[PDB]
Amino acid sequence: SEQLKHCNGILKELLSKKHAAYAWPFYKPVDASALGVHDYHDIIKHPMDLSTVKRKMENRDYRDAQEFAADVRLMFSNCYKYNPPDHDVVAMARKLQDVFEFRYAKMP
Ligand SMILES: C=CC[C@@H](C(=O)OC)[C@@H]1N=C(c2ccc(Cl)cc2)c2cc(OC)ccc2-n2c(C)nnc21
């Protein structure tokens, strides 16, 4: 669909150089143990990240744009859920969600 196309564009923007300063925490799945964090998967039921979104997109695993949005939003929600509101990673999530929500709203 033309909506899934629009979403692919958004994904590419989220991955582009412009946003790399606050998008990077979300490039790959959280490796919590590597960060010295060992309850992440007790708190977070379903991990999400942009490489996963990209894999689904590439593999045509998204039934519609709303499923795409559900994943991206979940990626942010996990971050907000697990971390305190003053966390710098939360700031990064908010800045990147700035981008996502705005471009997603421009969807035909
Ligand atoms: C998993 C551990 C919890 C957070 C943490 O305090 O890690 C030390 C963590 N912080 C970070 C984190 C903390 C501060 C800043 Cl400014 C950016 C990212 C984090 C880092 C990463 O490096 C590859 C990848 C994922 C991260 N992440 C995401 C997504 N959600 N929370 C985090």
User: Rounded CA gap, 74 and 99, in Å?
Assistant: 15
Which residue minimizes the CA distance to atom 26 of ligand 1?
25
| Atom nearest to 37 CA in ligand 1 | 2
Q: Specify the CATH number for 1-108; select among 3.30.110.30, 1.10.260.40, 1.20.920.10, 1.10.760.10.
A: 1.20.920.10
Ligand 1 cavity residues, CB under 6 Å: 25-26, 30, 32, 35, 37, 40, 79, 82-83, 88-89, 92
User: Which method resolved this structure?
Assistant: X-ray
3-class DSSP state for residue 44?
Answer: coil
Q: Could you state, in order of their start, the residue ranges of all structural domains in the chain?
A: 1-108
User: Rounded CA gap, 31 and 19, in Å?
Assistant: 21
- Measured in angstroms, the resolution is 2.0
User: Rounded CA gap, 71 and 56, in Å?
Assistant: 10
| 66 and 42 Cβ atoms separated by less than 8 Å | no
Of the candidates 32, 105, 40, the one whose C-alpha atom is nearest the C-alpha of residue 78 is 40
User: Rounded CA gap, 62 and 107, in Å?
Assistant: 16
